[PDB]
Design a protein around this ligand. Structure first.
Ligand SMILES: [Zn+2]
Ligand SMILES: [Zn+2]
Length: 55
């Protein structure tokens, strides 16, 4: 199933593929939003984004 970037709209074959695509945009992919699966290199950037799901 085409796994595409919600952000830029490129579909990948694998999740890890798109995961590395998502990693590519931020350099590296550390944390993810435990809800929507957005990768943040900063847990605080993440946190603020986590708080929009529970804020
Ligand atoms: Zn992207
Ligand atoms: Zn999120």
């Amino acid at each position: 199933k085409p796994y595409g970037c919600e952000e830029c709209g490129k579909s990948y074959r694998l999740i890890s593929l798109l995961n590395l695509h998502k990693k590519r945009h931020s350099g590296e992919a550390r944390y993810r939003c435990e809800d929507c699966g957005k990768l943040f290199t900063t847990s605080g950037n993440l946190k603020r984004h986590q708080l929009v799901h529970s804020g």
